[PDB]
Design an enzyme around this catalytic site. Structure first.
Site, PDB file in Angstrom:
ATOM      1  N   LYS A 261       0.823  -1.206   0.000  1.00 16.18           N
ATOM      2  CA  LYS A 261       0.000   0.000   0.000  1.00 16.18           C
ATOM      3  C   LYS A 261       0.858   1.258   0.000  1.00 16.18           C
ATOM      4  O   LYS A 261       0.608   2.189  -0.771  1.00 16.18           O
ATOM      5  CB  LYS A 261      -0.935   0.004   1.209  1.00 16.18           C
ATOM      6  N   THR A 262       1.864   1.311   0.874  1.00 12.35           N
ATOM      7  CA  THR A 262       2.668   2.523   0.982  1.00 12.35           C
ATOM      8  C   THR A 262       3.475   2.761  -0.285  1.00 12.35           C
ATOM      9  O   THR A 262       3.577   3.900  -0.756  1.00 12.35           O
ATOM     10  CB  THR A 262       3.587   2.442   2.196  1.00 12.35           C
TER      11      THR A 262
ATOM     12  N   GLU B 190      -3.518   6.276   1.631  1.00 17.15           N
ATOM     13  CA  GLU B 190      -3.381   4.861   1.936  1.00 17.15           C
ATOM     14  C   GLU B 190      -4.456   4.491   2.950  1.00 17.15           C
ATOM     15  O   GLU B 190      -4.534   5.093   4.028  1.00 17.15           O
ATOM     16  CB  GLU B 190      -1.985   4.562   2.475  1.00 17.15           C
TER      17      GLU B 190
END
Ligand SMILES: CC(=O)N[C@H]1[C@@H](OP(=O)(O)OP(=O)(O)OC[C@H]2O[C@@H](n3ccc(=O)[nH]c3=O)[C@H](O)[C@@H]2O)O[C@H](CO)[C@@H](O)[C@@H]1O
Ligand SMILES: [Zn+2]
Length: 475
Positions: A122-123, A166
């Site tokens: 995600k990051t 996010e």
């Protein structure tokens, strides 16, 4: 403008990375922010410098900092409700108590929102998307970070209509958001600690796809099995589904045709749909999973109307996020030099992908060994996925298995780091003494080796340590 409840905001645990980003966005949009934190940090110092009233330690008096009482109290996930004095005082005064995702959602309201979610990646994907949008001259608001702990965490109040975020999925935060563009990197059977089943964890992504605004887009990776299942389900729902992956098909929006790692970085030949010939995508980060993350960011960026060619140009500048195969350092120079990297991999798929990327960086290096130092993350996760962890670590030339990282979890009987080492068929050792690791890795090193510190806990500190013990060996 801010909603009435976000006008005077007291934040319990304001030193946290996500909380710090939220506090700064609030302060930049004209709101008043006070807060408290158990431990003083430099982020608390920065927020104090930005006019926030922060008290070290918790107390009821903190709710009298803001003029006219706090309109809201935000709290961290680690705070404990009926025992923290400030939450008790806030509920005694009638002041609302909320979590970070609710405030983030209220902050994303009027903007075009682009969420990125999934089991892992995600990051990295969110950061790629932010960098791509900024490389096109845009200035979007954003709030990235969470999956990699506090690494990669960063928020910013931009001057544009876009808002990248996010969105965590291990705690039900997805349902708080209303994406205009929702990106889904993968859906794996993990982080089931909060859902109690696998069906519930997949249903949370189903309900997230239900939350997309009409006319919005779902960018999704279809190499992941759960991701392809959700792609099909959302295609049945008549929702715009932009699929990306390696396997071709009659509905692919961005297909990864080829990928090869070279010395400078990687080069991937990709294929886009006609609505969005075979293009070249060069990257500065190693690993083939980075190609898929870049494709996800690219689709999300083009959906809001950014030209794909210069979006690829922007992706080519991405140098990585901390603890995503982050090069810690080097002893020696050129060939016969030892390089130390640090990764956050704590899922077996993450581990396999990180070790494959290290193998590819090492192969076109004319000789070297892959030595990994893995630290399992949780007691429950280790007791569950020990064989997966071991078979994943098998992709290294030598393994060093630390002990299990606590992470506020209750210790399980009969479980330790060795539970993983049992299933390691390659040369390995078990080093529960955290102090003895740095030496033993440096003593076992050899010229041209690629050392990786892998785990979601203390292990990130051994990065520089292994370097020092390596320079001591320079005799
Ligand atoms: C990603 C990560 O690793 N940490 C995040 C996790 O918080 P999490 O609950 O993990 O908070 P952590 O224990 O990691 O500590 C984060 C901050 O919380 C403060 N603290 C913590 C406990 C406490 O009782 N009192 C207190 O004030 C700590 O001072 C610290 O500065 O989710 C929060 C979002 O809601 C993030 O903002 C935190 O940064
Ligand atoms: Zn995880």
């Amino acid at each position: 403008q801010l909603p009435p409840d976000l006008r005077r905001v007291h934040m319990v645990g304001i030193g946290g990375a996500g909380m710090s980003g939220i506090a700064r966005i609030l302060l930049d949009r004209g709101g008043l922010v006070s807060g408290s934190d158990a431990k003083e940090s430099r982020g608390v110092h920065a927020l104090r410098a930005r006019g926030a009233l922060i008290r070290i330690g918790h107390d009821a008096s903190s709710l009298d900092l803001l003029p006219g009482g706090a309109t809201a109290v935000v709290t961290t996930h680690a705070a404990i409700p009926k025992t923290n004095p400030e939450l008790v005082e806030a509920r005694r005064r009638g002041i609302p108590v909320v979590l970070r995702p609710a405030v983030l959602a209220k902050l994303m309201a009027g903007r075009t929102t682009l969420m990125v979610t999934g089991t892992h990646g995600k990051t990295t994907t969110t950061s790629m998307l932010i960098v791509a949008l900024q490389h096109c001259g845009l200035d979007p608001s954003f709030a990235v970070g969470g999956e990699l702990g506090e690494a990669g965490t960063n928020a910013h109040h931009g001057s544009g209509d876009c808002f990248v975020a996010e969105a965590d999925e291990s705690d039900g935060s997805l349902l708080q958001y209303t994406p205009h563009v929702a990106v889904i990197t993968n859906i794996e059977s993990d982080h089931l600690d909060f859902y109690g089943s696998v069906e519930a964890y997949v249903a949370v992504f189903d309900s997230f796809v239900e939350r997309i605004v009409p006319g919005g887009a779902l960018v999704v990776c279809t190499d992941d099995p759960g991701g392809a299942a959700l792609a099909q389900r959302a295609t049945e729902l008549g929702i715009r589904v932009l699929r990306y992956g390696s396997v071709p098909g009659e509905t692919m929006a961005a297909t990864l045709v080829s990928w090869q790692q070279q010395g400078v970085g990687a080069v991937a030949h990709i294929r886009l749909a006609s609505e969005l010939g075979p293009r070249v995508m060069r990257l500065s980060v190693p690993g083939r999973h980075m190609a898929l993350n870049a494709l996800g960011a690219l689709l999300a960026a083009v959906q809001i109307g950014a030209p794909a060619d210069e979006v690829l140009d922007g992706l080519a500048g991405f140098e990585g996020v901390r603890r995503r195969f982050e090069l810690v350092g080097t002893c020696g120079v050129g060939k016969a030099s030892v390089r130390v990297f640090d990764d956050y991999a704590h899922h077996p798929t993450e581990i396999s992908a990180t070790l494959a990327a290290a193998r590819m960086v090492l192969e076109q290096g004319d000789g070297g060994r892959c030595m990994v130092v893995f630290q399992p993350h949780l007691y429950s996760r280790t007791k569950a996925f020990a064989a997966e962890f071991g078979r994943a670590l098998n992709a290294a030339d030598e393994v060093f298995v630390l002990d299990v990282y606590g992470a506020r979890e209750q210790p399980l009987a009969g479980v330790s780091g060795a539970s993983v080492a049992e299933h390691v068929t390659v040369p390995m050792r078990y080093v529960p003494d955290f102090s003895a690791v740095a030496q033993q890795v440096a003593a076992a090193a050899s010229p041209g080796d690629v050392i990786v510190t892998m785990g979601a806990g203390d292990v990130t500190l051994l990065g520089p340590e292994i370097l020092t013990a390596l320079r001591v060996r320079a005799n």
